[PDB]
Structure formats: structure tokens, C-alpha cells
Scaffold this active site. Structure first.
Site, PDB file in Angstrom:
ATOM      1  CG  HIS A  34     -21.868 -13.109  -3.735  1.00 32.89           C
ATOM      2  ND1 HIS A  34     -21.169 -12.165  -4.452  1.00 32.89           N
ATOM      3  CD2 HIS A  34     -21.267 -13.178  -2.523  1.00 32.89           C
ATOM      4  CE1 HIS A  34     -20.188 -11.684  -3.709  1.00 32.89           C
ATOM      5  NE2 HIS A  34     -20.228 -12.282  -2.533  1.00 32.89           N
ATOM      6  CD  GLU A  84     -21.704 -12.848   1.255  1.00 32.85           C
ATOM      7  OE1 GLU A  84     -22.652 -12.060   1.069  1.00 32.85           O
ATOM      8  OE2 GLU A  84     -20.530 -12.581   0.910  1.00 32.85           O
ATOM      9  CG  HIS A  88     -23.570  -8.639   2.945  1.00 35.17           C
ATOM     10  ND1 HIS A  88     -23.448  -7.403   2.348  1.00 35.17           N
ATOM     11  CD2 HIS A  88     -22.560  -9.396   2.456  1.00 35.17           C
ATOM     12  CE1 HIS A  88     -22.411  -7.415   1.528  1.00 35.17           C
ATOM     13  NE2 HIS A  88     -21.857  -8.612   1.575  1.00 35.17           N
TER      14      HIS A  88
END
Ligand SMILES: O=c1ccn([C@@H]2O[C@H](COP(=O)(O)O)[C@@H](O)[C@H]2O)c(=O)[nH]1
Ligand SMILES: O=c1cc[nH]c(=O)[nH]1
Length: 190
Positions: A34, A84, A88
């Protein structure tokens, strides 16, 4: 950042919450990435000022990412990787440039085979009720550190499903450390 949450998701479970429409994860019986989430003092670091996502920086990992980090909700891997990275990856860019970040995720995935770790204990996914403690214990035994188990509840049935397994790492992105945060209750379907 001081640690990482390497978050893998069980595609079928993630897609099981999509009650309508297509969802590639439904046919993917393997844990996939993920994301790799930098942490700081027990909290997730997100949307840090960093380099914009650059697809050319990971062309060398593209084939691997298509297999290990597919977008399980829709057929658009790049959009997911970009999301992502931006949300992140930028938060660990101080030491991991984009290429290194995705490489970390790939290596982590290749070194954290959840199904392989659960198979010997017949604890693989079978749509039956599993024990959070048991699953964490199996992974703790196999990898030496406790994983983080994340679940999602079906609002209509109140049934909790395991959707993600977190492998916690130190800031070096290589030293596995114990996770301590789960969103799963004592039991869940897997
Ligand atoms: O295979 C997946 C899994 C999650 N998401 C999306 O990514 C977000 C969740 O990840 P995060 O923002 O908390 O890293 C949501 O918008 C979700 O729809 C995807 O696009 N594909
Ligand atoms: O990445 C995450 C998500 C939730 N809670 C945390 O502490 N970290």
C-alpha cells in the site's frame, strides 16, 4: 522521521469493501504494497515539502512495482505511486530520494512474505475468523518482530476484516522493529 510503517494490503479484502464496480484487487491473491509511511514520535508524517513525483526516477523498478505495488482499486499504478510518494515518501526524502524510497518498498516486500509466513500455520486467508494475537504471533516468530494489523469494518454487518499488515522498520529502512499499533480488534476475518 524516526521509523517506517511498511504497509501491505490484502487486495481481495481491500476490494471487498467496494460493493460495486471493478476492483483489480479482487483477483489478486497476494499481499501487495500500500505504502511506506515515515513516522515521527509515534505518528505518521505526511505531505512533507519535497520533490514532485517523477515517474522517470522509478522506470528501473517499474516492472517490479507493477507486481508488488499495483493499484488494487483501479488500473492506474502510477497515480497510486505518485499519491504515496507525495503523501508519504516526501517525508523521508531527507535520506531516501524517490528511487531509493521505492526500492526500499520493493526490498521490504521481497523480504516480508506474509502468506509464506502464515502458510505453515494454516493461517492464510480463507474467509474465516482469525485471532489478532495468533497472527501477530506467527509473524513475530517468523520475522522476529510484531507486525501491525489493520482492519476495516463492514458498516452493515459490523464484521471486521484484516486489510493490511504493517512491518515496522527503524529509520535505516532495514532494521525491522516491533510494531505496536493495530486497528484490528481481537478477531477479524481473513
Ligand atoms: O490499491 C490501492 C489502495 C489505496 N488507494 C488509495 O490511496 C488512499 C489511501 O492511502 P493513504 O493516503 O492513507 O497512503 C485512498 O485515497 C485510496 O483510495 C489506491 O488508490 N489504491
Ligand atoms: O502511519 C500511521 C497511521 C496511523 N497511526 C500511526 O501512528 N501511523
Amino acid at each position: 522521521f524516526d521509523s517506517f510503517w511498511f504497509v501491505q494490503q490484502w487486495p481481495p479484502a481491500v476490494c471487498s469493501f467496494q460493493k460495486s464496480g471493478s476492483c483489480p484487487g479482487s483477483g489478486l491473491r497476494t499481499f501487495t504494497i500500500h505504502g511506506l509511511w515515515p513516522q515521527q514520535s509515534g505518528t505518521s508524517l505526511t505531505n512533507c515539502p519535497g520533490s514532485p513525483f517523477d515517474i522517470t526516477k522509478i522506470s528501473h523498478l517499474q516492472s517490479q512495482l507493477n507486481t508488488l505495488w499495483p493499484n488494487v482499486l483501479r488500473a492506474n499504478n502510477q497515480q497510486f505511486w505518485s499519491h504515496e510518494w507525495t503523501k508519504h515518501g516526501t517525508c523521508s526524502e531527507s535520506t531516501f530520494n524517490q528511487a531509493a524510497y521505492f526500492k526500499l518498498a520493493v526490498d521490504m516486500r521481497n523480504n516480508y512474505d506474509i502468506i509464506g509466513a502464515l502458510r505453515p500455520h494454516a493461517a492464510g486467508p480463507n474467509g474465516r475468523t482469525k485471532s489478532r494475537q495468533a497472527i501477530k504471533g506467527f509473524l513475530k516468530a517468523k520475522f522476529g518482530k510484531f507486525p501491525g494489523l489493520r482492519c476495516r469494518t463492514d458498516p452493515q454487518t459490523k464484521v471486521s476484516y484484516l486489510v493490511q499488515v504493517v512491518a515496522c522498520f527503524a529509520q535505516d529502512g532495514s532494521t525491522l522493529i516491533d510494531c505496536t499499533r493495530d486497528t484490528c480488534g481481537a478477531n477479524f476475518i481473513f
